[PDB]
Design a binder for this molecule. Structure first.
Ligand SMILES: [Mn+2]
Ligand SMILES: [Mn+2]
Ligand SMILES: [Tl+]
Ligand SMILES: [Tl+]
Ligand SMILES: [Tl+]
Ligand SMILES: [Tl+]
Ligand SMILES: [Tl+]
Ligand SMILES: [Tl+]
Lengths: 134, 134
């Protein structure tokens, strides 16, 4: 029996580049670094970057990782990353503010205002095609 | 500005199949289902499944998603998944018991005993190549 997410691990071709992005641009804390990886923390999230040199990034699909942000900080976050030249991969069409951006290898990230409970609430009013609740 | 992990989204080719895997085999609670996806919950983890009928699973790299498990439940979980025919993608060699298995699309998963604190404790006494804390 599982208790939740324990850690998220991303393959990275350029370790120094990825540490810089997550620590300096996104605000993660660098807890450890070694020749082949790094461990960072953000709130309770344990992130690990695992160096893998010929890594060519993910394939083109919907898999992505969303981080929380308070409503009051959204606009400034989005403005800051855009000013830094981060590339976006999706435009927001779903409940709560969301900014959809890529990391150095092309891993798909998201900064989202909202949670499961708020998404479910909005859904109960405006169902996606064929929605069942339970 | 960011606060933590808000949600994990995985692309899935066969929605019925992935739902059955996460709910029954891993014990996630199914909160909602629609023609193109599902929302499941485990502890504070919000898992989203996004249907992509032609999706062929990720490429081969170290990107993976680990879920927490208590030391006393570990053997049983591993034993159970092995009996159900789940395929493994790695053998444990780092601090804390870990079982590394694939989902139906080939996303790489992990059930892990321990956390960042426990890992940092072990690393100090035995550092990886060129490790540094801070
Ligand atoms: Mn999302
Ligand atoms: Mn791991
Ligand atoms: Tl948490
Ligand atoms: Tl780890
Ligand atoms: Tl959204
Ligand atoms: Tl979502
Ligand atoms: Tl999608
Ligand atoms: Tl381990």
């Amino acid at each position: 029996m599982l208790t939740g997410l324990n850690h998220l691990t991303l393959a990275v071709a350029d370790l120094p580049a990825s540490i810089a992005f997550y620590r300096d641009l996104l605000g993660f804390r660098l807890e450890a670094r070694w020749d082949q990886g790094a461990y960072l923390e953000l709130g309770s999230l344990w992130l690990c970057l695992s160096r893998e040199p010929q890594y060519g990034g993910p394939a083109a699909d919907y898999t992505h990782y969303a981080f929380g942000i308070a409503a009051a900080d959204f606009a400034r976050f989005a403005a800051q990353l855009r000013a830094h030249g981060v590339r976006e991969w999706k435009q927001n069409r779903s409940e709560g503010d969301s900014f959809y951006f890529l990391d150095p290898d092309g891993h798909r990230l998201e900064a989202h205002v909202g949670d499961l409970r708020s998404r479910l609430a909005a859904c109960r009013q405006a169902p996606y095609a064929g929605m069942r609740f339970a």
